[PDB]
């Protein structure tokens, strides 16, 4: 049994990726952000303040014959970019890409921060990190994928994200036909609740991998590739027009730069992010200055292989084996 759900970038700068999820009976279809960097499935709902939810699709549990409120359950989450949300908890049927989890924790937001209010195209998150991170109290809720995993053909899911084009989130099988190399695996450390792994080294512009390893997390819910200041410095060292822009809070450079690739080692295999994908966006319409897809992790204190990196590959989140696979795309 499998699931396959088309995803799409929310805007022209691939800020985040959106995928439909059907909750309840009959199905209420919500566009949600699948986030392998958090552990809670939360939605804008009929309990979200109308002033916060206006313009967003919402889940209304009273119109679902399979919903049930979880007495005494509450939750609150603060995200890496300063955004937040909090609420109470229902269970209901949740179907993604045609595969259903019958009794899934669906966290209803009774408060969300301005960032989520303004992002009208999403209606919440599906947390796909480890169950240990789930924020429901007193009793944590399992993630949709953890609940689905024992009933799928295999307990794995894949992310295929693309620049400016629809991609897919698949469950229960590995569609390598979207990739041009084989899946290479490395072990995951779930001690902090994340898909944390170590890349064995990196290279800028295509020479041999160095052995300067990088510990970081595979996060479909982060836009950028966020790496330490030494790596950022190495990446931009020969990008002539590169400079830190205090207003953008990031490195920028002329849009016509021919950017070098960024490669990193998954065990002894290489994944290469082409320079194309390291140019995120012009600073505004018609601008000659562009914002880099690789930026410093020094602000958040943890390296994050976000969508900029994930776009270079078919990425296998293998919960059965607690490993992370990357096939060059």
């Amino acid at each position: 049994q499998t699931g396959s759900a088309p995803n799409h970038p929310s805007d022209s700068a691939d800020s985040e990726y959106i995928t439909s999820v059907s909750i309840g009976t009959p199905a209420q279809v919500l566009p949600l952000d699948f986030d392998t960097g958090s552990s809670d499935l939360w939605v804008f709902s009929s309990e979200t303040p109308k002033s916060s939810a206006t313009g967003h699709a919402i889940y209304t549990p009273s119109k679902s014959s399979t919903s049930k409120k979880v007495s005494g359950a509450s939750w609150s989450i603060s995200y890496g970019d300063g955004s937040s949300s909090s609420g109470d908890v229902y269970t209901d049927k949740v179907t993604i890409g045609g595969f259903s989890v019958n009794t899934q924790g669906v966290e209803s937001a009774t408060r969300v921060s301005t960032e989520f209010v303004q992002d009208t195209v999403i209606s919440g998150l599906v947390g796909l990190a480890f169950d240990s991170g789930n924020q429901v109290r007193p009793h944590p809720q399992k993630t949709w994928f953890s609940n689905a995993a024992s009933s799928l053909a295999e307990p794995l899911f894949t992310a295929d994200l693309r620049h400016g084009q629809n991609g897919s989130y698949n469950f229960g099988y590995i569609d390598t036909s979207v990739a041009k190399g084989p899946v290479a695996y490395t072990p995951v450390d779930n001690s902090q609740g994340f898909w944390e792994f170590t890349a064995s080294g990196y290279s800028v512009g295509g020479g041999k991998l160095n052995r300067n390893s990088i510990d970081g997390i595979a996060d479909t819910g982060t836009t950028l590739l966020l790496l330490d200041d030494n790596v950022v410095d190495a990446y931009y060292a020969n990008v002539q027009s590169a400079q830190y822009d205090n207003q953008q809070e990031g490195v920028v450079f002329d849009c016509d730069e021919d950017l070098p690739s960024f490669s990193f080692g998954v065990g002894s295999s290489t994944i290469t992010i082409p320079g194309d994908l390291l140019n995120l966006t012009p600073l505004e319409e018609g601008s000659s200055t562009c914002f880099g897809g690789l930026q410093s992790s020094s602000g958040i204190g943890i390296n994050i292989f976000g969508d900029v990196a994930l776009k270079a590959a078919l990425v296998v989140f293998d919960l059965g084996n607690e490993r992370l696979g990357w096939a060059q795309k």
Binding site: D35, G37, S38, Y79, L125, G133, D219, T222
Partner: peptide, 6 residues
């Protein structure tokens, strides 16, 4: 950017 549960 967005950065999702620090």
């Amino acid at each position: 950017x967005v950065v999702x549960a620090x």
